[PDB]
Design a protein around this ligand. Structure first.
Ligand SMILES: Nc1ncnc2c1ncn2[C@@H]1O[C@H](COP(=O)(O)OP(=O)(O)O)[C@@H](O)[C@H]1O
Ligand SMILES: Nc1ncnc2c1ncn2[C@@H]1O[C@H](COP(=O)(O)OP(=O)(O)O)[C@@H](O)[C@H]1O
Ligand SMILES: Nc1ncnc2c1ncn2[C@@H]1O[C@H](COP(=O)(O)OP(=O)(O)O)[C@@H](O)[C@H]1O
Ligand SMILES: Nc1ncnc2c1ncn2[C@@H]1O[C@H](COP(=O)(O)OP(=O)(O)O)[C@@H](O)[C@H]1O
Lengths: 436, 135, 443, 442, 442
């Protein structure tokens, strides 16, 4: 499951830390940024403890300095079964939902209910089905010889089981699972009989299994609101869910928690590029962070002393000071030559690219000259240029050809400022003619 | 919508006949070459002039899927309610028709009157015979 | 005989086996470095491993930025999906622009699936329904079963319908003497038409006649289908295809775009992963092309920053022709090509260069050859110096009034007097602006 | 119909060598613009190329829309001509790109050839079998001519056609198989016994003779936009008239393009390009120009003719001024036809033609006074004064407009400059830009 | 009897073949504007031209709306007249272009005439007569239906089709009820029960329409007056159908939709076909827009497009601004808030302010309409009051004077009552002086 080709943060499998929350120099695909990784590990221990709620953490720094990488590492080290809602800042300006309603849905998607239940199933291999039918179809009789690798039995079947076996046609040689209470019969496949293919089950026929369900609060909010069904969880037209059913869900969840029938898991809400939110969003967040059913909100931004959207003044990080009072700030730093070389080596091993040493030094030099992402993007173009001339190892001139073909930001600005008469300026004046 | 009946209303009331409802009513059973019917039959004239009942179909959907199945393990009430909602007999009878020999068995052989039948045949007609299916 | 419109003299990038481009081959003249870079990009797309790579074609007006993207599209072929787009398409009055960008991102990832079909087909010989014990009980339908008799070549079967199947049997209005086609996957029924075993000319309903189907009544066949992920998303968002109430009422309502949630996309991804894991489906990453990228505002750029870091997104090509232009939706920031620097840091920029006089001359010569016209050499030189004087597009678009004026004097060749007449009749932007400046009442 | 502004223009008035006559088809003057419009007309009539933008620019009251109407009149039938204004793009249901795509796709016609069978015969026997609820209807029809006798089977739509405008077993009707039309030609039997109701006082007609069934190749034109609207959903034919076609998806348009190419390959259908005319194109946003710049490069694109009466002015959606109110990208890929102002002789001939169109007889001195006022003021004012002078002439009971009627119409109805002078002389009487007005006359 | 700011004017008051007199029809003064409006009324009654535009301009309290209503009264009640405000075009359901086109099509009327052949009255007998040879496997095969009808001074027995008995059974036609059968369609409808069958049961719901006058059979010629917009909204919406969409939309909110140009073209061609047959008459009317400065330049551009149509009616615009910026533009200075493109396409009628004697006469007519009795010295003081402050302030201060006269148990207004009404109710100038000379947020 979970198909994926290659991502920009696909080499990161978690925060590289020891048992004392100390960062290794290189572990789980993350190098450098020791203090930020330690602080994110402390935040991970906050999430794993779960005894506190509504704490806001801001990750701020220069662009292309391990912010989204840190968020991806926290999400990978959280594991499965714990909600993680990663949204962008421009995703809440909707046309059918208000900004506060979309923010409320994104807040309530990150708190889960854990419910354990038990059900009994008959998973077996069908030896023989015998069906006795009448002329008019009044009374049906049925014998079912079914087995595992451990037992063997014969069952008399009633009329509704005859109807449920005729529908979704079960033949001899099949492996099926039957639910007695609901009457759901699933064909797992065919057994190992050459005369798809699965293994015949072992042990008892009538098994009792415990399944664990994690249901978000937003799902129960959609279900309890009678105006729309559960298909609004998939189609997306929930449409301004009222606060009365939210109050009923908030009371019933605590009622289940006191009786021990369910458990509370908190999650992480990540807001990438938080500076694009409006002032009314920040004013809503300032009061939504103080609820008992509030997750931990991590926000990432790279702006420095910019204009707050919806106002006319300037604020640090694009955020007003009342929101910044309610947050603790993790600050990232720029990378050195050695860490850039290590990151580029990790990305070379990730994309199955074989690199010479001098090509790696050239990539590190042009990475500390221009950008990390530019050298991270040249490394796969140079492999195709290498494969055009039929050799596996990327050499120095293979990097030089890709450097010549594909430009960066500074060279493009230089060439545009040199030949600005051929481009459209702000005033809309261009020159298309060559002569005169 | 389904069991809407055209019951009579008394004259001493404030809801009267708006003019466009009167124009809709005078052309309910009016034949051809009448002036009000011909002024009210633009769309069928455009249908019969443009030869639209012999046209082909140029578009088919790529994927056709049933609605998402909701399952609750260990309860028959949810299965019964889901099967009632998916296959509501009143709506499913409204979107189809009774066979003619079955109707003859209800009315003559069983004594059931015509007005006691469930309402049938509310499905809208397709444009062509070619437009009635995705195959 | 054929139709030409501003393109279709371009067939591909036109490179060697080593990626070295020729001077003129495949409808292109010059632009060797850009064509080599586009060939490298085409090879990278054909490698089918990378996700979320972005290039930007930067250049002036009338320099060959759209032509390179169309050459990339024809180099990949119709097998790989290619989604063209303009920057103004993302502003819809039905759904937000972020959802439209996500939709166009998911529309560029294809899938090829070998699918099994269980079919019952043949000619209907008998159709007998049987009635329920109490039909007016309120719960339960009028009938209980319907017996149908299907006859095909070398086979004749008898089937007992579920009434739910019989509703879709009756809705296509089948009868005795009709060839049908029942698909057991969804229950959809196709009425092929009347069988030709009976009479033909005694009808009045313009029907078509089909012989008996070959083979048995019950069949299992293999259909190879091509699809995108967006098709699965809109199929599961608006469910049509089933025989229940909701899928039946979904076909009659007005279709409307909605905000498809991420949970549906993850479920579709899991089902597609199960499909390819079985050795049934094959995944084809594609290309999304956006022309005039400067029309995008800062919110779409900020969502693009997030969307390019996913593990599904295809190769996206952009184009712009602005030097130092402020970003739309902002008030003071000035960034190259109208593209903000945080997205510029994730791109690969490909420069496009202007042409010389001889390149303009041979481009005009190829355009005159493609549009099936005969041009004299002196008229060609006059058109070349006109194209260097004013614009390449003005010299290209004046060829067809020259052809009309050459046809109206009973001639095939285009001469100098014809080019002078077309100069006198039609104007360009510079002469029109010179008329506008020395004008009386805003002429 | 009613007399409109351009009801006197039937064609362009061109020779076979595309040389415009000085006075032909209701158009005088403007020789080079009419020559260029004839070249554009020939380019449209050839149909070889697509996506060429033509711009018509000039001062107000010069003949831009008159030239477009002359092109549309000389275009002839079965070639579409979608003429829209610039402010029709902005809607609350469609986007600007979707509205422009529909405007582009309304201007390409598909000519489809079909085969049909015509039946003309005297009705003999009608048997109609219906269910109890009236849902399932079937039956037989025995029809005859003087030479043969045929029994046909009937469908639901045919019985619905027979039940409307009832035929009564002895009439003469007509049958079209492909169209499904029922046309009662008349009655030949002349029955004596007739019920008090009904009553076919249909005109007498002889019974038709010869072959009952005849084959005919018919042809008809549809637009591409109608094909997309029909194939969009279940009830697209209603949406063709109600306009409820909201944001048709791209997959529909791709499949329709592929099927149109298939129909061209099989010889069933042919493609006829048309003209899309945008009057007052300067009332468009920069996003619309950006969409047009890429929509003009497609194969299924019509010839786009735009009209502008603006000089250098601010482009809508931006903050800089551009020539003709249009950005230089759209001005690069267009060829511009320039119109020029008129003389006194051309204005006199225009007023003579407009007086002949409104069926108003004019004296010579009244025509000279109208020429003088149309030289001083605009042409449209002296054109509008003719009907008022005719009404004043009919009030005094003489059917010839004299000088004093034009003088009285000049005194009664004011110009723009005279009204500006009267407003500027009495500025306190009117509400100014700051909302201050002096109502009291003390 | 209700009086509201108008209805003291009964037409313009011109004589035939001449000019306006000084006082007639509730009008005092304004001779030249009345003559111009009479010429416009004669042009509208000539029923030939299309899309002519009149802008009448002047100060506040001058009589532009009174002149428009006088035009509407002078035309009569059979010619359509559509009043409108420039602020009404901004709707949040459909675009303003569609609203302007709907108000354009509302102003054109169609007069149709038809002949109906009916049979109505109380049923005397209802016998479905069986056939001589009934068919096997069936029951009660009917050859004809005998229905007897009775009305005032006439009874008549009929002989019907076998088919109508199904409609008799579906419409629940028993004995003693009053039925209605038109000739060509059949289609019996049940109009009610006779009044002679009213008091046999104590409780019932069915109404009792009495016996209809005249004979049972009479051909009646009816005349119906519709508009083109009624035909458009009748053809666009579907008829009574059996589909679920038609019944679902009939119970839902009637949301306005963008009517296409195709439906309008089909409506115009079928209307022209029936006009050429000699059955239908076309009556163009007036579309009146008050305060046209509220329109922005997009609606002005679409007005420029739509005034050159083939069917467009006479449009009358009213405005009171001077040199004002056009709405939607920041730097275009224009007379009356109207851009020069539209200004060039219309004729301007100027209206002039009044003097003291005309103010006194207008106050006299408004007093004699409101059934009031005014003293002469009080009338002169009210005329002085109207000279000093406003005409509308003097007109609106009449009913408080009458109420204060009634409170003192007198039937005549005196000087003391108008002084009390002066002191009690303020005008704009004294209220502005109160606002300026106070500093307590007044
Ligand atoms: N500590 C790290 N370990 C591994 N890769 C890193 C690290 N820091 C940054 N990167 C790489 O640098 C790139 C920029 O990181 P990211 O945080 O996404 O940018 P930004 O800081 O602008 O959000 C990412 O593709 C990531 O793979
Ligand atoms: N190398 C080339 N060979 C042939 N034609 C070209 C070449 N470069 C550009 N053109 C032509 O110039 C026109 C403008 O190119 P296009 O890329 O569409 O616009 P722009 O360059 O302004 O983005 C196109 O119609 C194309 O046919
Ligand atoms: N050559 C001509 N023949 C007939 N009418 C003309 C001619 N030139 C101008 N007119 C009249 O002058 C007006 C021109 O205005 P219009 O057609 O809107 O185009 P433009 O706004 O470009 O001048 C029209 O009303 C038309 O009746
Ligand atoms: N010539 C006139 N004779 C009689 N009453 C008039 C005359 N002109 C205006 N009035 C009265 O003045 C009042 C306001 O005038 P109005 O028509 O509203 O002017 P405007 O429309 O320019 O504001 C109306 O109630 C009308 O009765």
């Amino acid at each position: 499951k979970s198909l994926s080709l290659i991502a920009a943060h696909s080499h990161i499998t978690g925060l590289g830390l020891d048992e004392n929350l100390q960062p290794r120099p290189t572990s789980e695909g993350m190098v450098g940024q020791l203090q930020a990784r330690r602080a994110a590990g402390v935040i991970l221990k906050m999430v794993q403890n779960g005894t506190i709620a509504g704490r806001a953490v801001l990750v701020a720094g220069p662009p292309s300095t391990g912010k989204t990488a840190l968020a991806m590492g926290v999400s990978q080290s959280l594991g499965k079964d714990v909600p993680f809602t990663a949204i962008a800042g421009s995703e809440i300006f909707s046309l059918e939902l208000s900004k506060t309603e979309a923010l409320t849905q994104a807040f309530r998607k990150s708190i889960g209910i854990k419910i354990k239940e038990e059900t009994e199933l008959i998973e077996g291999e069908v030896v023989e089905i015998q069906i006795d039918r009448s002329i008019t179809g009044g009374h049906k009789q049925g014998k079912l010889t079914i087995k595992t690798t451990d037992m063997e039995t014969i069952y008399e079947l009633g009329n509704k089981m005859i109807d449920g076996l005729t529908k979704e046609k079960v033949l001899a040689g099949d492996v099926i699972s039957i639910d007695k209470a609901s009457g759901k019969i699933t064909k797992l496949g065919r057994s190992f009989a050459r005369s798809r293919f699965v293994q015949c089950p072992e042990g008892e026929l009538q098994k009792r299994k415990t399944v664990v369900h994690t249901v978000s609060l937003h799902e129960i909010d959609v279900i309890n609101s009678r105006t729309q069904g559960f298909l609004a969880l998939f189609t997306g037209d929930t449409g301004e869910i009222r606060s009365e059913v939210r109050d009923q869900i908030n009371t019933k969840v605590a009622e289940w928690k006191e009786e021990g029938k369910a458990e509370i898991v908190p999650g992480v809400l990540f807001i990438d590029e938080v500076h694009m939110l409006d002032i009314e969003c920040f004013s809503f967040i300032n009061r939504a962070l103080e609820d008992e059913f509030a997750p931990i909100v991590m926000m990432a931004t790279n702006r420095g002393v910019s204009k707050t959207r919806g106002t006319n003044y300037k604020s640090p990080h694009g955020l007003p000071l009342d929101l910044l009072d309610r947050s603790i700030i993790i600050t990232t730093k720029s990378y050195n030559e050695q860490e850039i070389k290590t990151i580029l080596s990790i990305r070379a091993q990730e994309e199955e690219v074989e690199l010479s040493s001098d090509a790696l030094d050239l990539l590190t030099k042009t990475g500390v000259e221009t950008s990390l992402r530019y050298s991270s993007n040249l490394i796969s173009v140079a492999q195709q240029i290498a494969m055009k001339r039929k050799n596996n190892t990327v050499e120095v001139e293979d990097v030089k050809r890709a450097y010549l073909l594909f430009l960066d930001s500074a060279r493009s600005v230089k060439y545009v400022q040199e030949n600005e008469s051929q481009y459209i300026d702000d005033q809309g004046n261009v020159q298309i003619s060559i002569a005169k | 919508v389904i069991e809407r009946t055209n019951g009579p209303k008394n004259t001493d009331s404030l809801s009267f006949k708006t003019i466009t409802q009167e124009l809709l009513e005078v052309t309910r059973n009016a034949p051809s070459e009448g002036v009000m019917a011909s002024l009210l039959n633009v769309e069928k004239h455009a249908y019969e002039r443009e030869y639209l009942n012999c046209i082909q179909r140029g578009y088919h959907p790529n994927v056709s899927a049933p609605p998402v199945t909701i399952e609750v393990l260990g309860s028959s009430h949810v299965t019964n309610s889901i099967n009632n909602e998916l296959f509501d007999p009143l709506i499913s009878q409204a979107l189809s028709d009774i066979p003619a020999i079955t109707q003859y068995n209800m009315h003559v052989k069983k004594g059931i009157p015509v007005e006691d039948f469930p309402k049938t045949g509310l499905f809208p007609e397709p444009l062509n015979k070619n437009f009635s299916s995705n195959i | 005989v054929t139709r030409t419109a501003a393109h279709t003299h371009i067939k591909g990038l036109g490179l060697d086996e080593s990626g070295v481009a020729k001077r003129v081959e495949g409808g292109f003249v010059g632009q060797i470095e850009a064509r080599e870079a586009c060939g490298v990009i085409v090879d990278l797309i054909k490698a089918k491993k990378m996700s979320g790579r972005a290039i930007l074609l930067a250049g002036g007006p009338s320099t060959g930025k759209t032509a390179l993207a169309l050459a990339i599209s024809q180099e990949l072929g119709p097998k790989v999906p290619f989604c063209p787009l303009v920057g103004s398409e993302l502003y819809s009055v039905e759904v937000k622009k972020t959802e439209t960008l996500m939709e166009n991102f998911r529309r560029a990832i294809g899938l090829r699936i070998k699918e099994t079909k269980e079919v019952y087909e043949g000619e209907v010989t008998e159709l007998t329904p049987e009635d329920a014990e109490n039909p007016l009980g309120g719960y339960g339908k009028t009938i209980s079963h319907v017996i149908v008799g299907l006859k095909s070549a070398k086979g004749t079967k008898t089937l007992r319908l579920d009434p739910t199947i019989y509703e879709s049997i009756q809705r296509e209005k089948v009868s005795i003497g009709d060839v049908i086609y029942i698909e057991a996957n969804t229950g959809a029924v196709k009425r092929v038409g009347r069988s030709d075993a009976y009479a033909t000319e005694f009808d009045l309903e313009t029907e078509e006649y089909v012989p008996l189907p070959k083979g048995e009544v019950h069949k299992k066949k293999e259909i190879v289908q091509d699809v995108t992920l967006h098709d699965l998303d809109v199929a599961n968002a608006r469910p049509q295809g089933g025989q229940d109430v909701i899928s039946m009422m979904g076909q009659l309502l007005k279709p409307k775009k909605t905000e498809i949630t991420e949970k549906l996309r993850q479920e579709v991804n899991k089902v597609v992963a199960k499909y390819i894991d079985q050795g049934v489906a094959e995944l084809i990453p594609g290309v999304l092309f956006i022309d005039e990228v400067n029309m995008l505002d800062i919110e779409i750029f900020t969502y693009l920053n997030k969307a390019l870091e996913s593990n599904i997104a295809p190769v996206v090509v952009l184009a712009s022709n602005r030097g130092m232009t402020t970003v739309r939706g902002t008030e003071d920031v000035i960034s190259p090509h109208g593209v903000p620097p945080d997205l510029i840091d994730r791109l690969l920029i490909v420069r496009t260069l202007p042409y010389d006089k001889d390149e303009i001359r041979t481009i005009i010569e190829r355009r005159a050859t493609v549009e099936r016209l005969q041009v004299e050499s002196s008229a060609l030189d006059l058109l070349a110096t006109m194209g260097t004087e004013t614009s390449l597009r003005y010299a290209l678009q004046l060829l067809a009034p020259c052809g009309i004026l050459a046809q109206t004097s009973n001639r095939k060749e285009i001469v100098v007097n014809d080019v002078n007449e077309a100069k006198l009749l039609f104007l360009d932007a510079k002469r029109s602006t010179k008329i506008l400046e020395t004008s009386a009442n805003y002429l």
